[PDB]
Design a protein around this ligand. Structure first.
Ligand SMILES: CN1CN([C@@H]2O[C@H](COP(=O)(O)OP(=O)(O)OP(=O)(O)O)[C@@H](O)[C@H]2O)c2nc(N)[nH]c(=O)c21
Length: 152
């Protein structure tokens, strides 16, 4: 009776367009009314996307997740982007997608150049867990990953 909409939507047969649309609408409306980073309901949506897209990818949903996460991080509220990096690392481990991998590299490079390591650690973690071989890794990103190689 008290279960959160995101909890229902993450069940195997639990996702329905009707429930998700009403949930997404309220979250986005709260983000606009209360402001970026000020809506805890919006944070649950970031968390939902981070998990749900691993098993049920959809281009437009991912692109909205990505766009809002980056908007929030620019304002200084990084939960959305942390959810995105977790999606990249765990999601690409589950099923590799070339276009999503390219985004993963691009956002990791930006994250590192902004003085953060959360993205770089998640990329390094992906490399340790994934079975994917012959990856085409940005030469600049390989250089950044060199910091972690000397540590282990
Ligand atoms: C095995 N775990 C997992 N965990 C915490 O429970 C949550 C889910 O585990 P997780 O998603 O694998 O950690 P994760 O988020 O991927 O790594 P990180 O939080 O650094 O981004 C995370 O906040 C993780 O830090 C743990 N916390 C404590 N104190 N002890 C533990 O053994 C564990």
């Amino acid at each position: 009776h008290m279960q959160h909409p995101s909890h229902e939507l993450l069940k195997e047969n639990g996702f329905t367009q009707h429930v998700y649309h009403k949930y997404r609408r309220r979250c986005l409306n709260e983000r606009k009314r209360l402001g970026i980073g000020q809506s805890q309901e919006m944070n649950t949506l970031f968390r939902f996307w981070s998990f749900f897209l691993r098993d049920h990818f959809n281009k437009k949903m991912y692109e909205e997740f990505k766009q809002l996460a980056l908007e929030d991080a620019k304002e200084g509220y990084r939960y959305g982007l942390e959810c995105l990096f977790r999606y990249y690392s765990y999601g690409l481990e589950k099923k590799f997608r070339l276009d999503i991998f390219k985004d993963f590299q691009e956002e990791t490079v930006k994250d590192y150049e902004a003085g953060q390591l959360y993205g770089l650690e998640k990329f390094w973690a992906f490399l340790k867990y994934s079975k994917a071989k012959n990856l085409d890794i940005d030469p600049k990103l390989q250089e950044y990953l060199g910091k972690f190689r000397r540590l282990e």
